[PDB]
Amino acid sequence: MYLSKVIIARAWSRDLYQLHQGLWHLFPNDFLFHVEKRNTPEGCHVLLQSAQMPVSTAVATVIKTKQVEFQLQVGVPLYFRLRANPIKTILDNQKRLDSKGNIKRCRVPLIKEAEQIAWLQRKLGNAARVEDVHPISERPQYFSGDGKSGKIQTVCFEGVLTINDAPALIDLVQQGIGPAKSMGCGLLSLAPL
């Protein structure tokens, strides 16, 4: 796969919806991204993982691209970073009913750290062991400026893991982890110690 640093012009990266759109246009000939800097004069700085090399547009400038060929062995420790959207489903607390007379089932973010770590370890499964992790609960990202706007609530997991199954870990990196992959979640970044 390819890893690129991309900068999206401010006027074209104001809404969450716009980011994916702008990035999609980089492939004129399925990608993942991680926002590195949300608001600068020149716009939004993104790390972009893709199967094809991106091609700059007028609004999305590819600053640099590097191809990754993986060399993983079992037992190797790696730093990891993953911005994710961990969620679960619960019954509405006020037992509010939907149009068919049923209690509403609501999607909610995981806010308890123990539950966030459990979610991560569950997604990684047989691919790797979490050796150490710090789940940073980030500020939510809103769909619009409207007072009633919904939002996406993310956690940025950072720490160290140890590889247990190389092919399984590669698959996780290629596919991305968890919901909201089109909104800048799911990109699992790895690095040697």
Angle at 7 between CA 22 and CA 140, to 5 degrees: 75
Question: Residues with Cβ < 8 Å from 24, sequence gap 6 or more?
Answer: 31
> What one-character-per-residue DSSP string does 57-107 give?
-SSEEEEEEEE------TT-EEEEEEEE--EEEEE-TT--B-TTSPBPEEE
Strand partners, 17: none
Instruction: Give CA–CA dist 79/77, Å, rounded.
Output: 7
Contact residues for 147 (Cβ-Cβ < 8 A; gap 6+) = none
Asked if the domains 1-70 and 71-193 are classified in one and the same CATH topology, the answer is yes
Paired residues of 7 in beta bridges: 45, 61
State the CB neighbour count (10 A cutoff) for residue 38. Answer: 14
Instruction: Give yes or no for a contact between 23 and 31, defined as CB atoms under 8 angstroms apart.
Output: yes
Q: In angstroms, rounded to a whole number, what is the distance separating the alpha carbons of residues 59 and 95?
A: 47
What contacts 24+ positions apart, CB below 8 Å, involve 85-91? 85/109, 85/152, 85/153, 85/154, 85/155, 85/178, 85/179, 85/180, 85/183, 85/185, 85/186, 86/110, 86/115, 86/116, 86/119, 86/120, 86/155, 86/178, 87/179, 88/115
CATH superfamily of 1-70: Crispr-associated protein; domain 1 (3.30.70.1200)
As a whole number of angstroms, the distance between CA 47 and CA 33 comes to: 6
Joined tokens for residue 78: 């790696």
**Beta-carbon count within 10 A of 96 CB:** 10
In terms of DSSP H, where are the helices of the chain? 16-24, 113-124, 166-175
Residue 21's SS3 state is helix
Measured at the CA of 158, the angle between CA 152 and CA 159, to 5 degrees, comes to: 155
The answer to whether 151 and 107 are in contact (CB under 8 A) is no
Length of the chain: 193
Q: Are the C-beta atoms of 186 and 87 separated by less than 8 Å?
A: no
Can you tell me the distance from the alpha carbon of 6 to that of 132, in angstroms, rounded to the nearest whole number? 30
Domain map (residue ranges) of the chain: 1-70, 71-193
77 within 8 A of 131, measured Cβ to Cβ: yes
**Domain boundaries 71-193, corresponding CATH code:** 3.30.70.1210
